[PDB]
Write a protein that binds this ligand. Sequence first.
Ligand SMILES: COc1ccc(OCCN2CC[C@H]3CCC[C@@H](C2=O)N3S(=O)(=O)c2ccc3[nH]c(=O)sc3c2)cc1OC
Length: 128
Amino acid sequence: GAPATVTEQGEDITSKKDRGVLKIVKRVGNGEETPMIGDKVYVHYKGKLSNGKKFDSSHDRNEPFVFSLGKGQVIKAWDIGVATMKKGEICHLLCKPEYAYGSAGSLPKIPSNATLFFEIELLDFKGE
Ligand SMILES: COc1ccc(OCCN2CC[C@H]3CCC[C@@H](C2=O)N3S(=O)(=O)c2ccc3[nH]c(=O)sc3c2)cc1OC
């Protein structure tokens, strides 16, 4: 399935090249511009654990998830991954725990040492 495919066929987008964050572009977005640090970014996403369980979805809430890019408001994999996206892009990200919730996990849904899969759509980005 998609998690296996990004695990085996994804591109390492980390600066360390430690394969901690792998990406596949699923839908090519618009133009060449990616967001800049501090931009307000609007995304839709769904996340799955490596046991196949969906643990979150913005679609199911009928509202996007909004954060300021590159400020540690989200897991490291998201700051790194969303920074690579164009407006309108959909990607898959495979996130090792060192770029996610680490040994701590995140109760109630994310266990210790969890590799996470996300589908992310970059809806918009704007400077404030
Ligand atoms: C700078 O370092 C950090 C900053 C913020 C962090 O977490 C708060 C931000 N945040 C939650 C929003 C959401 C979308 C954005 C990505 C991610 C997220 O970052 N989660 S998520 O889908 O993985 C997700 C969803 C439901 C859910 N239910 C649970 O019981 S656990 C859980 C996890 C953690 C950081 O380092 C550990």
